[PDB]
């Protein structure tokens, strides 16, 4: 869980939705795992979603939901190295 | 609602859902589609390929928050598969 890039363990709510809320509109897609303050056994998914900050909650399929992950941040990644020229 | 979402296919089964999001082999790595468990008939089901290879994740009040972040999934395998 560590080893992936889009995890970010102790991050909080605020600073995660500062996090992917940087750009504004056009970081839609942009999120972040990290674990829950106020519920320490849960992580969170926080996300852009046209501009806005949504959280949501994540409480035996742990591998394969990484994998989900890694593939929408690869997704994520092709963005940032494949830009739509201007 | 769910049902309003392109990425939403209903009914599907599990092994038409694998069938879909493998078209393309690798090449469709990240598509995606969720549908009704067709063996847990309250949930649904998250099938999508990864690297060629189908996966299942079976899937409060977050309902709504859920289709958003599954609709930006959606529209960034456009540019992804282009």
Redesign the interface.
């Known amino acids: 869980l560590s080893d992936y890039p889009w995890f970010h363990g102790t991050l909080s709510r605020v600073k995660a939705a500062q996090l992917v809320l940087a750009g504004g509109p056009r970081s839609?897609?942009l999120?972040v795992i990290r674990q829950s303050e106020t519920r320490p056994g849960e992580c969170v998914?926080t996300?852009?979603?046209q501009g806005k900050a949504?959280?949501?909650?994540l409480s035996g399929?742990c591998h394969?939901?990484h994998?989900?992950f890694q593939?929408?941040f690869?997704?994520?990644r092709?963005?940032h190295t494949?830009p739509?020229p201007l």
């Open positions: 839609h897609g999120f998914l996300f852009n979603f949504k959280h949501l909650r399929q394969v939901q994998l989900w593939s929408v690869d997704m994520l092709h963005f494949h739509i």
